[PDB]
Design a protein around this ligand. Structure first.
Ligand SMILES: N[C@@H](Cc1ccccc1)C(=O)O
Ligand code: NA
Ligand code: NA
Ligand code: NA
Ligand SMILES: [Zn+2]
Length: 866
């Protein structure tokens, strides 16, 4: 497969302004008729190259003339000798039932639906499948009335008819020009939840949410979230919906989360369906996040789109920032900030050290679905947030306004967005642009000094970015470095230099530089990199006492959580080293004291408390080490939980009972008490065994919602409690017919700490509720084993790797996108020890040798083996 380079971008030789599609739908054989008004911009000897994959061409007309001057290669229909303006007509055939990859037009249970981002429209007909070609679509759908009574596409429904032999048709029109990746089609039978939303200027929008028949009782939340998204985008950003109808379809067979198709979002049903006994707080909040996200894409992705795919982060970083803000405005901003920073440090940093490392704007891509990443999405968002941080809300909104004023109705670049922010605000982001071109995690080292003679605090901050596999050259970045100084009473010391205030977000633009603060009337305890003001690793030599001080006194809750993380990090590293020598856990008492103090703080917000009493994931802990010992890490996380459970047993139990809640609400106070309560239950499960077994079994059986029942079920598995097999069996007997709810069960099995976990996982390939035809099922059992049970995936004997290789040999043919997601734990081999590394490389070498090796895996395997 061939690599594409950002620096080869060229405006297309031809444009299409309008396309009229006809679909004669059938799952075995669908006929597509595509009539496209085109224009030649390039030179006359330059042919029209149309992208096309797995299509059966039936005819080619140019202004109704059967055309003889074309050929087919090799993903492409090449048409020669065209005029400056003409009507292209293609008829081709495709086969949805055969589409196991879920790219293009495929079959989701009984329905037919599309997924066209990034390059899936080319699996439907011959087209200029590239997001700098925008056109006005109209879409006619003919089908069997009984099997497909609903026929949907983008925009407004403008015509409809019956035919002989049980067939009907509908025609849709989307008046807004768009790249073909935003095209969508759905056909099938559904229950429909219908409501409306009236925009701040008075436009009444019909809202329609299509779900499998039976599931209307799981739709109101998603509908409520859509309304909330629409309202928030008006309030926060000044943006209103631009169409008369908003459709959302929930489908069970989908590779990602959801797709922002204009006026017709298609959603993985895991981010639509919720009922209090099937779904958790997290589900509810995710449903809110994704509905918001796809909604916010209507401006930051649709009304302004991407000139080319190398610009993905232009809409994803920005649109993620948007879902974060929305979630944060509506809920707890601190809790949101915290989890998003867990994700950055826990997962994204790993990618930015991996062989798949790339800038948020990639320079080279072989298969574009491999670039829907933590880096492009999450770090992308941190980069938007740094722009927010440097500009302030007011100027940020002016940049948004200028972005849209300049680029509405067109396809922009990352640079265009940055130019608009710069131009609207008058802040220079010239150097800041480097965040877009440079990969890897900057490391920021901080060294300080107090001078009591002069009452001055001196900070000497330096930065380096280690070379990455993709880039041998690295330079300093424009790093917004937010600080606060505390005196001995916990009061904030005003920042100043000779007479005048100083903004507390420092501009760290150099390899090394020094900042001097006057009037520091007492040796300060500093809070560094507040609110995670840049996506960097922080090096500063904290004492434990500085950190416990911050946990009591820091003004932002993030800082208090984060200080607790730095307190733990030191002892996680200590105890991994101890595990490696067969010694048991050592933990000074003042650490356990700090956590007792949080459990008993009457005034601390229970949401913050619960995050503090949530130990870093194994994936987070992993980022503390050059070489990862996944077994030591897993065993230490367990030991640390056991120790705290033991020290704090009484406090844990007290806080657990005090936070009991009779009623179940999805409301930020209630979620917070419940999250704290379950954090407590978790430690308790690792305490005294008879009490653990009684508490957990009781909670599972008494629970009136899935959040409480699953926290228990999950503790039973984690702590290997006596009641575990019964509870697991019960859950299965109750929920086996519901795939989404079983995912939770499969994840628990896949992540069990049991000795025979792999063996069970293998057996679960035969489970009634499992199937390899469903990505959600694949992800919850196989993916969760390989990505989320690193102790078992990395067994010394290599069984984890073989298991994955056998699974990937299947999926590479069936569904390369899901395969590529699953391969990721294997391309991290360079982070593990030599013997592990050899086995993993052997596994990658096996997979490289498959016939019909997919481009998706090829890209990762060749990078991982370099
Ligand atoms: N554009 C979708 C994600 C997506 C990409 C590619 C395929 C499927 C889904 C989003 O960001 O929400
Ligand atoms: Na689609
Ligand atoms: Na166009
Ligand atoms: Na809030
Ligand atoms: Zn997105």
């Amino acid at each position: 497969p061939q690599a594409k380079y950002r620096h080869d971008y060229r405006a297309p030789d031809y444009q299409i302004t309008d396309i009229d599609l006809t679909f004669d739908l059938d799952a075995q054989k669908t006929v597509v008729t595509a009539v496209s008004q085109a224009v030649r911009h390039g030179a006359s000897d330059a042919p029209l190259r149309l992208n096309g994959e797995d299509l059966k061409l039936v005819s080619v007309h140019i202004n109704d003339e059967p055309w003889t001057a074309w050929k087919e290669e090799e993903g492409a229909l090449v048409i020669s000798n065209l005029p400056e303006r003409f009507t292209l007509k293609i008829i081709n055939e495709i086969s949805p039932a055969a589409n196991t990859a879920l790219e293009g037009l495929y079959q989701s249970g009984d329905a037919l639906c599309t997924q066209c981002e990034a390059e899936g429209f080319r699996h439907i007909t011959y087209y200029l499948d590239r997001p700098d070609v925008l056109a006005r679509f109209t879409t006619k759908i003919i089908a069997d009335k009984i099997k497909y009574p609903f026929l949907l596409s983008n925009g407004n429904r403008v015509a409809q008819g019956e035919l002989e032999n049980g067939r009907h048709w509908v025609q849709w029109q989307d008046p807004f020009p768009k790249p073909c990746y935003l095209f969508a089609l759905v056909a099938g039978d559904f229950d429909v939840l219908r409501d409306t939303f009236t925009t701040r200027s008075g436009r009444e929008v019909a809202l329609e949410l299509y779900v499998d028949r039976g599931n209307l009782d799981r739709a109101p939340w998603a509908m409520t979230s859509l309304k909330n998204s629409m309202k928030w985008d008006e309030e926060r950003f000044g943006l209103e919906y631009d169409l008369d109808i908003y459709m959302i379809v929930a489908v069970d067979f989908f590779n990602a989360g959801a797709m922002e198709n204009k006026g017709l979002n298609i959603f993985n049903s895991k981010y639509v369906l919720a009922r209090t006994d099937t779904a958790t707080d997290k589900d509810y909040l995710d449903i809110e996040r994704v509905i918001g996200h796809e909604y916010f894409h209507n401006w930051t992705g649709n009304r302004v789109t991407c000139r080319d795919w190398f610009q993905l982060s232009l809409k994803e970083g920005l649109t993620v920032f948007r879902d974060q803000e929305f979630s944060s405005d509506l809920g707890s901003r601190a809790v949101n900030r915290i989890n998003n920073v867990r994700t950055m440090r826990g997962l994204q940093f790993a990618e930015d050290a991996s062989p798949m490392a790339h800038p948020i704007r990639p320079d080279m891509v072989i298969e574009m679905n491999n670039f829907y990443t933590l880096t492009v999405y999450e770090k992308g968002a941190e980069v938007i947030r740094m722009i927010h941080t440097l500009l302030g809300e007011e100027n940020f909104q002016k940049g948004m306004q200028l972005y849209f004023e300049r680029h509405d109705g067109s396809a922009a670049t990352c640079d265009d967005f940055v130019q608009a922010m710069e131009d609207a605000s008058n802040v220079d982001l010239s150097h800041f642009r480097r965040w877009y071109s440079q990969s890897g995690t900057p490391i920021v080292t901080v060294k300080d000094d107090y001078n009591p003679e002069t009452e001055q605090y001196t900070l000497t901050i330096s930065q380096r970015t280690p070379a990455t596999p993709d880039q041998a050259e690295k330079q300093p970045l424009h790093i917004p470095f937010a600080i606060e100084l505390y005196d001995n009473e916990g009061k904030v010391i005003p920042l100043q230099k000779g007479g005048h205030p100083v903004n507390s977000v420092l501009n760290v633009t150099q390899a090394e530089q020094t900042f001097v603060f006057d009037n520091v009337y007492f040796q300060p305890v500093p809070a560094l990199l507040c609110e995670f003001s840049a996506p960097v690793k922080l090096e500063y030599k904290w004492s434990d006492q500085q950190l416990t001080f911050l946990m009591r006194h820091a003004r932002n809750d993030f800082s208090r959580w984060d200080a607790a993380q730095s307190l733990l990090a030191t002892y996680i590293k200590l105890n991994v080293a101890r595990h490696q020598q067969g010694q048991p856990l050592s933990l000074p008492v003042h650490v356990a004291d700090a956590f007792r103090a949080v459990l008993l703080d009457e005034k601390i917000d229970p949401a913050l408390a619960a995050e503090i009493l949530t130990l870093p994931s194994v994936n987070e802990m992993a980022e503390l080490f050059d070489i990862i010992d996944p077994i030591a890490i897993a065993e230490v996380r367990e030991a640390l939980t056991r120790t705290l459970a033991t020290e704090l047993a009484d406090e844990l139990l007290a806080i657990y009972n005090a936070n009991y809640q009779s009623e179940y609400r999805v409301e930020h106070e209630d979620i917070a008490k419940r999250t704290l309560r379950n954090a407590c239950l978790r430690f308790l499960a690792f305490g005294e065994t008879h009490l653990a077994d009684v508490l957990v079994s009781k909670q599972f059986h008494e629970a009136n919602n899935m959040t409480d029942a699953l926290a228990a079920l999950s503790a039973a598995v984690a702590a290997q409690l006596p009641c575990r097999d019964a509870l697991m069996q019960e859950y299965d007997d109750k929920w086996h017919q519901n795939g989404l709810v079983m995912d939770k069960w499969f994840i628990l099995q896949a992540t069990s700490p049991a000795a025979n976990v792999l063996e069970t996982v293998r057996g679960l390939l035969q489970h009634r509720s499992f199937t390899m035809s469903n990505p959600n099922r694949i992800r919850s059992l196989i993916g969760a084993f390989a990505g989320s049970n690193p102790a078992a995936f990395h067994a010394e004997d290599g069984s984890g790797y073989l298991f994955l290789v056998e699974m990937l040999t299947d999926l590479n043919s069936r569904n390369p996108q899901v395969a590529s997601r699953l391969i990721e734990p294997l391309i991290r081999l360079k982070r593990y020890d030599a013997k592990r590394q050899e086995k993993m490389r052997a596994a990658l070498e096996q997979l490289k040798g498959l016939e019909n090796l997919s481009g998706d895996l090829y890209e990762k395997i060749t990078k991982a083996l370099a």
